[PDB]
Each structure stands twice: as structure tokens, then as C-alpha cells.
Amino acid sequence: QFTGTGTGGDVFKVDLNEQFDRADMVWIGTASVLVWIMIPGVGLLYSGISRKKHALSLMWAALMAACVAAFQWFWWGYSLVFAHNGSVFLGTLQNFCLKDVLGAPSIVKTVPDILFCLYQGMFAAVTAILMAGAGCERARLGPMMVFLFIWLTVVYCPIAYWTWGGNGWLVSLGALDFAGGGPVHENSGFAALAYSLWLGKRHDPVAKGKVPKYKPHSVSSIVMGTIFLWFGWYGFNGGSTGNSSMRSWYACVNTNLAAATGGLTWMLVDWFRTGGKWSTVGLCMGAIAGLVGITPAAGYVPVYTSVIFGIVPAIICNFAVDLKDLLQIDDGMDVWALHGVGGFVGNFMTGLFAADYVAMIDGTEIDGGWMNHHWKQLGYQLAGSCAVAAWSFTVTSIILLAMDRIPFLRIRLHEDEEMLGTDLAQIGEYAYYADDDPETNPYVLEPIRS
Amino acid sequence: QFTGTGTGGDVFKVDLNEQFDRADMVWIGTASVLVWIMIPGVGLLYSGISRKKHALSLMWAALMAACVAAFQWFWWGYSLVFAHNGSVFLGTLQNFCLKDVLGAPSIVKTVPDILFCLYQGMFAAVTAILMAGAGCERARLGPMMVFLFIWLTVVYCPIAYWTWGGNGWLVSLGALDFAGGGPVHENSGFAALAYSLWLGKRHDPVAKGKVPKYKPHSVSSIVMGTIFLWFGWYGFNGGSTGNSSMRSWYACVNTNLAAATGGLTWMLVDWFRTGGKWSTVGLCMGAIAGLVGITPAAGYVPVYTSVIFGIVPAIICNFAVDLKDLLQIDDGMDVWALHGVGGFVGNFMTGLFAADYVAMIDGTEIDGGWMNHHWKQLGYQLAGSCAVAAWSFTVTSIILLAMDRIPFLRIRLHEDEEMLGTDLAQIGEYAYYADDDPETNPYVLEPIRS
Amino acid sequence: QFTGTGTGGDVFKVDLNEQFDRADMVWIGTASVLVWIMIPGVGLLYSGISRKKHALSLMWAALMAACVAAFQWFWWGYSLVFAHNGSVFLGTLQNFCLKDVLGAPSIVKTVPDILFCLYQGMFAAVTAILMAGAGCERARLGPMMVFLFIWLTVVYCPIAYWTWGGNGWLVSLGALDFAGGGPVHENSGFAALAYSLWLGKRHDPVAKGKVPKYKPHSVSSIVMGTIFLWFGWYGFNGGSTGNSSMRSWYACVNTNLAAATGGLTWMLVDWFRTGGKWSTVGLCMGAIAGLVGITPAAGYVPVYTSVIFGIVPAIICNFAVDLKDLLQIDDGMDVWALHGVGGFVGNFMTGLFAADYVAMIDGTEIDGGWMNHHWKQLGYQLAGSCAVAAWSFTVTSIILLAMDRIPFLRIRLHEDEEMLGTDLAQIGEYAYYADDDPETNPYVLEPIRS
């Protein structure tokens, strides 16, 4: 018999696959593979956009993040989000090292635990490289890897549990978050802001007003990142139905249209604000703003409203990027502006435009948003957004400051203890610091103490 | 009940998904995602092959084209091709802003309208970047975006309707075009030729005989473009069955073999013509020539004949590229040679090698080509090819010349009104023109009037 | 009726697709497309890692290999592995030019011949670029293409037959090889070693001890290669079930975890051995070592053991790379170390950790390994590994030395007959040798005789 718990049954006695539609499984398997390539997509995007020379290559750091996140997820991340037996705030260690993760129907009943594990693990990894990218400036790699492991454990996993978990309190409340805009984008964005405000370079010369808003390290990297992100986002959003229904393809149409209108909107805004220039970076940032914006909404809103999920996040995020000038901080702030602000805005607008008849395309039951005169929905969205932002900002701050107090865990060295790469390159043991060309340097040019 | 029209039925009363095989839908969903990455594939290919420094980066322009095409398709492109109620030449605005596009079976009855919309929208976008690439030299971006919107509307959509539309006159005639070689490749190719002959630089120093046939801007971009194109072409051709049958995988085998033999053929032709050199660009152009060649044929011809769809387009396109020397025009001509000539040749040969027993692999009924002694088939193919070439060349010419007469819509400035980037870089307001390195320049170095 | 042989039946009388689960077919179709992009993944990886300037760009050579392998596979490669009527060592020419390859159930009964042909053809192509990459230094292209065709025919196809063929003697013996670690990785690795020992540069200045272990040509190429390889490996391993069951997704979870732990392990080993440096190349090589390691095991071992398939191959391969210093040979040795040694180690450990209850997830019956007290399994694995290594090393040696004796087939010129690119660039007919920048050079800078 099928037990519905643990491994789901004895494989020598039952065929666990009989519980699931095979095409549902194939689409979520494919969607998993698509989300995986978003991981280097993030790295390429933020490597390319940077107005500063990062010692750590974020294209490469994306592979590091893929490794650390996969291990964390296996170790206990999956279990802390999707153990079928948690509180309303967190799971348990019931599935430590993926013990008994096999063929029981997952919280998404149309796929087995092992496949939901594969799929959702990719979301954790995308969030990991968002966070690594946000905090990469003058990062020490050892501490960064420890930080990512800890951060996934006590920031990502709780927020993911609230959003996706069987007893997650946001689920119970009635908040909507179609493809995990909260755990991935809003979360990483406000964690990025914690990094900016505590560890980021202040009075940063690249952020002092009379300097260009856009000054990319590599436009080709921006474009390649945006390509991988848009391509992969079809799995990110399209797979968030958990099935092969046409709500999946509907979500993909919304995804494409939000990206498209976001890109054009941001570029048009830049055109107006610059007095007629065509912004290469702006088009890409706008596509990302729309992809982020539509993430909580893609399987819930009517197709024609998806254009609003491009336009409004593009406009608001474009102006949010200007805050870097007020603060005179660059580090971490792009991730905050696109993912934190974009995620907040998209989540809010999901309360306005969610429609029960869109969810019903595959039989999913929701009360809907303002499209259905369900006025309360907007309050549920705000509650989710504020909770995510509060937890992510506060707990990320605590982790960063706690690690800072520990010499061998300090992620970013204090400027009074930091050795100059110019001077390191003169010391014999550190002569390899003379090659700050990450295209040929075999070693990360890690900050060194005195 | 299932209505077969409009949304296809009331989602609160019926499950629209019951009409479709879930695995059919998953493959066409996946194929959609694969065709999307062909869009930057085109941009990379034509950016890399260029013998001239384009101010507009085509890798980046591919994302711009993805945005413009997605919006056009949503706005009315989809409706003009696939409204279930058009003439024999064009659709209607019944599905303006994708109104009522949901779960009715599409013209391809094995998938719902919303999924066919997703899939076919990708073909429009691939064609958009082919056209943007063809017309990119000294292009002004604002006018280019307007041009693409207009061109998709009155050149792409009619030709697509004739080919795929429920009452399309090419369909009724009996012409074969498996994966839309007409609307995508032959169309963009002869539109490219219109660009070359009216707007392209004449007496072009890079096309004056004593200069190299191959002189690529970036071989790595050529190769990356070819990679994305070949990878994505499995969705382009493999999804054109509309189903999960083994005719889909048969089409993929044909696709791979045509690419392979095209690449080797073009490189061998170059080897003979150069007296023993191995042409890096030639291998890539040959793979594209074979992919284009097999596009109208992939689900119709026996596997062993797919090698002819590599060899013959490779040879003919290789010599077509030489016409650039006779004309002394470079701009737009590569797109014409590969897609216009390749598409024409492939469409012609489909009349020779189409077999009813190949179509019958998934129950598709055709009379076949010369393989079945259906001699008339070749005439149907020629009719389609000539109609596509005539409409695309003529109407593209009219659009380009009409926009040229309008100062704020002129796509390419006349040489007497065009400001020198060298001189712009001296004027204070235009000092950013001094950085013509598109890897770090945040702005398109758009042509400026006097 | 369904015949089970030849084309599988008359398409005008029966629907051949009725024999197969459509979702099984869609996943293997998708997996085919994913394995295809591993081909340029290999090229990028070995182009980037190189401590030497290769005249042949391996990114480009990957497309050449895709062409040659697809043609060989069509011509007779498929038939020599999967003709339903061979010996215990090789197939026949029954499916020459894919004659009668259509809808009969393949050796993997859940998919038709034409789809298994598509899928398995990709494995041949991945192996082809591994071999081209291994033997690329100072290679002449014409001879290289002939070599690849011959090598696929008499080295790859026999080993593939033993592993996958209906009567393959390794299958009969009881050896386990889930995703073809033998035919692809161990095979190419020991073929690479044959290249190193017979044709590779000896007393190579880059391999003389006092020089860096890691000195990459292009870290961005390494990372992009690793991205394409890890992404594609989900199809490589995940599709090796032949079905849409959750054993496919289980294999993907193992694949991701082995890559992740391999990357971290190799980087940590480098950290210890260098006294605290963070190795950019090492992380990537470790992910590949884990992907190779888990390949024979992914659908057979419990998830928690997949971490061992990252850790142990990473450690052993890391030290295997040191052999380059002892031998003072660089050419071919990276492919041997990762794929030859990694493949050998993974195959061995599959005998330890294979579990009948993992195979049983989709009803697959195996005796298992030491996890099931099936002690004999380790001996079966060793037999397979030694047979593959012996055949590949010996026959590759014979091919290389035989071609060397034939002036127009010699793959690498002898140093006494080899012309200097510096001196070629002075001879008028060879002036194009002055541009050794493969990013703009339209021609392969092939070695020229005196």
C-alpha cells in the first residue's frame, strides 16, 4: 500500500510512481534543470553590472554557491523547509541528509518528495548566489562559504517554510506567493541591504552623485546573465504549478511578457531621465525587475495584467537604484534594488491582480485579490512582505555582525587590518597577487591580514 | 462542456486540461523554452561574424528584440496569425492583448491556445532578431524598435498566417513547411535583402573583392551563437509536430544530421576554394545553412535524405555569400545568404524528398513529394517560396523607404546628416562617444544628426 | 500488429507510439537536448584549463566534433552499438545509415529505436570532443577528423556495445554502469593517456615541477564549460533510466550532490596543499570529478553515498594530475586524470555502494553491491574497468601510430618537419599565420610541413 509518509511505501511491493502523473513529473524535472542555470545567470549578471573591480569573480562564485547550497540542502535545508512535521515557523531534522526522501507525495501532491527536493533545492541555490553576489566585495572566501551555510539555514529556510511549508503561517494566513518571490527575491534583497548598511563601503567614490549611475564591468556578462536568467525563469515560474497543466504555460506567457515590458520600461525611463540616451544596462535590469515582479503573481494574474508587473517594478526599481547616491553606498545595493524592492512591489501587486479564475485553470482554489473584490488580500500580502523583510534584514545583520567579532569568521576585513594587493605583490610568499587578472589567475585574490 | 471556441469553456465547471495529452503539452512547453534561447543565439552569431564594427551590439540587441517581439505578439501579433476567424491572408483582432486565449484546442489541436501562443511567439521573436541583425548597421534604436513592431505586424504575421493559419492559403494549396522555414528564415532573409539594397552601405570597403570573405569580429561569439542555435533548434523543429510522438524525435535526428553535414560541407567547400585552409567561420555558417535547410523538411523527409539538406544548402549558400563581392554590399547580406537562400533551397527540396510515410509516423496525412511520385508538390513549394520572397522583399522595402521619409522615424541617417563619433566625442554633451568599447559603455552609441 | 523488429510495424496500419509512455519519451527527448550542450561544455572546459596556447580552439573544435560524431553515428556508429543482432563484442551494419530505425522498442524498451538513437548519439559526440580535446595540441585538422571517425568506430562503439548492447558481455557478466561511465569517461581518459604517451610533448616546460599546477588560459571558459557540463549532466544521468519515473529525479539529486561535494573537496584539498590558497580551477575540476564519479552510479546508489562519489574521485583525481610532473607531459593528461581516473574510481565504488532497493525505484532488478552483501559485484566492476582501459589504451595507440606512419594521415607533425608559425608568417602564401589570435582569425593555424 501507499503510506503517504516516509519513503511512501516498500518499493519491492508497490510502484511508487503510480501515485503521480508522469508528465507532471517530467515538467518539474525539466523545470529543475532550468532553474539550475539561473545560478550562473545571477553570477554573470552581478559580475557584469558592477561599477567596481570585485576580486571575487561572481561568475565563478556562482559555481561555489551551487556547491555550498546543494550540500546545505542535502544536510538539513530540505528538511527544515519540507519535513512533513514542523511547527508553523520551521521544519525539523526528520529528513536530515535526505533520510526517507523518496516517493511519498510532497507538499505539492502532484510530485514525489525526491523530485520536489530536486526542484526546491534549486531555489535555495539561486538565493545563495544572490546573497554571495550581494556580499562579495572584499569578501574572504572561507568565511563567505560558512556564512552562506548559516544564512541558508536560519534566514532562507524559515522564510521558505512560512511560504511553502505544510504548516507555514503565511500559507495559513492566505498570503499568495506563486513562485517564491518572498524566500528568493525579497529575502535576498533585504539581506543584501543588511550587508550594505553594516559591511558595505561607505562614502564610496563610485556612489558619490557626480558619477555615472551605470558603469558596467562587462556588458557581455550582463547580457549573458540576463539570457540565462530569463531562459531559466520559465522553469522557476512555469514549474511552480507543480504540474503539466496549462496553468504552467499561462505562467510562462506572463513571465515572458513581464520581462519584456520591464526591459522596455526601464530603458524608456532611462531615456527620459538622461535626455535621450539608450541604456544598455537599463534594458537588462528592467527585464530582471519584471521577472522578479511577476514571480509571486505568474500563476495567479490575468495575462493582460502581467504588463503592469513589468512596468511598475521597472519604474520603482529604477528610482530605488538612485538611493545608492543618497547613501553613498554601492556594495550590495543592486541586489537590494532589483530583488528586495522588486520582490516587495510584485508581492504587493499580487494582492491587487490575483484572480480566482486564473488559479482555477488547473483547479487551484484561491479567494483571489482585488480582481475578485477580496480586499483583505492586500493586507495578507503586506503582512508577508513585512515579515520577510524584517526577518531577513534583522537576522542577516546579526549573522554578519556576529561573524565580524570572530577573527577567523570575519567576512570582510576592517580597513586598518587589510593588506594592499599592491603591497602583497611585493612580499615573496604573496607574489601571485601581482596578477589581478581573474581570467588567468588560478587563485582567488583573497584579502590578507597584517 | 468543452466549447472548442473562445476560452474553451468555464474553468469552474470543466477541466480544460482533459482535452489534451499532458506529455504533448510538456514537450511543447519545453520546446518553447528551447526556441527562446535561439533569440540570443542569432544575436551572438551575427555579432561575431561581422566584418565591420557595429555600434549596436547584436548580443544585446537580441534582448531588445525579445522584448519588442513579446509585446507585439501579445498586443496583436498572435491574433493576426492565429485568430480562429480570419481571411485566407490574415487573421483579426479577436485575440487583441490575448483576450480569450486559454484552453480551446489551437490550430494544432494537440495543444491549447495559451501554449500554442507561447510556442509560436518564440518564432516571431527569432525572426525579429534576424531582422534587427540584418538592419543593424548605423541603426538608430528608437526607429529600429518601431520598425520591428511594424515589420512583425505587416510582414511576419501575414506570411505566418499563410503558413500556419487555419485558413492560410499556402496550407490550402498543399505547400509543405514543417517548422516555418517560410515565416522565419526565407522571410527574414528577403527582408534582409531589401535592407541591403536600399539602406546598406554601397561600395563597401569590406566587400570590394581583394578583401577577405571571412573576417570575423569575434569567433567565440560565432561559436556561442551557433551553440545556442543548434541546441534551441531541437525545440524549433522537434516541437513543430505539436506532440510527444516519435515523429518529434525523428525530426530531431534529421535536425542534428543536417546541421552536421552542413557544417562539414561548408568547411570542405572553403578548403577546396582556399587551396587548403580550414575555415572556422565556414563550419559555423554551414551548420546554420543545414539547420535552415532542414527546417521546412524535418518532420517530412526520410532520415538518410537529411544529409542532402546539409550538403546542398551549404554549397549554394557558400556561393551566395560571394554575391556580396559583386554588389559591394556587406550590410544585411549574411542574413539573406543563410536564411533567405537557405530557406528557399530547403523549401524547394522539401518538394522532392517529402514522404507520406514519414508524416504518418504520428498519423499526419500528406500527399508527399517526389518520393511518392507527387510531382505537383514541387510546384506548391515554389509558389510558397516565391510568394514569401515577393511579399517580404516588397513590403519591407516600402516600410524602410516610408520611415526614411520621416525625420524622426528614419532608421539609418543619410551620410550628409550623420555626425562623426570622432567629432561627437569632442562636443561636451556627447563626450561619452569617446568610449566605443561596448563592453564597458553603458549607452548605445547611436548615430546623431547635425 | 507491432513486430518488435525492424521499423516496428507499418505506420499506415498501426500507431507505433502506442507501445510507449509519452512522458517517458518526452523526458528522454529533453535529456537528449541536454546532453548535446555538454559537447561545447567539454570544449570550453579544456580550452580554458590549458596551460599552453593551443592553435586549435577547443570551443570551436566542439562544433567540429558534434558534426563528425553525428555523421559517424548515422553512418554506422548507431548500428555497431545497437543493431538488435550482433555478437557479444560488436553489432552489425543492419542499421547502416539508420536503415529501419524507427518505432521498434529499443534495447531500452521504454523508448523507440529512433529516440534511443537520438539520445545515445549524444554520448558518442561527448566522447568525440573529449578525445579531440585530449589530442588537440599541434593537431592537423584533416587527420584529426579522420582519426575521430576511426576512433568512434573501433574504440567507442565496441566499448559501448559491451556496456549497452543487447548481448554486450559486460551486461551479461553483471557489471553496473548506470550512465555509461565506461564508454564515455574511462574510455576517453585512457585514450587520452595513449595520446599523452605516444604523441604528447615530452619534457614539456609547463610540466617541469617548479612550475604552477594551475595556469589557466581562460578561467571564464573553464567556468562556462563547467556550467554547460553540470546543466547537461542532468540529461546525461537523469535520462539513463530511459523513463519518467522518480528514479530519474533520484539520479539527478545524486548528480547535483556529487558535483557539489567534488567541487568543495578538490578546492579544500588545494587549500591544504597550497598552504591556504583558494583554487579557482580546482573548484571546477572537482565538480567534474564528482560528475564523472557518480556517472556509473547515479541510479544505483543511496543519496547519502553520492557525497562519497564527490569526495573520493576529487581527492584521487587531484593527485593523479600531479603525475604530469613526474612524466613531464602536459598534453592529453587532464582528460586522462578527470575522465580516465575519475571513471575508473567511480566504476569501482559503484560495486561498493550499489543498492537493489535504489534500482527498484522504477522496478529495475539488480543484485546490488556491497550494500547488499553482493561481494562479487566489485569483481565485475574491476573486470569492466580493466577491459575498457585495456581496449581503449591499446587500440587508440595502434590507431595513432598507424596514422603517424602515413604522411597525409599523420595527426601531429614530427618536430623536424614542423614549420614555425613565426616563419610561416614571413612566407607570402602563409602570411595569415601572423594573426595567432583565434578570436579574429578566420582560419585554423594548422601545422605546415617543410
Author numbering:
A (entry chain A), B (entry chain A), C (entry chain A): 4 to 453
Original paper wording:
structures of the Mep2 transceptors from S. cerevisiae and C. albicans. function as ammonium receptors/sensors in fungal development. a central channel for the transport of ammonium. non-phosphorylated, with channels that are closed on the cytoplasmic side.
different crystal forms to high resolution (up to 1.5 Å). sequence extends for two residues beyond Ser453. differences in the rest of the CTR.
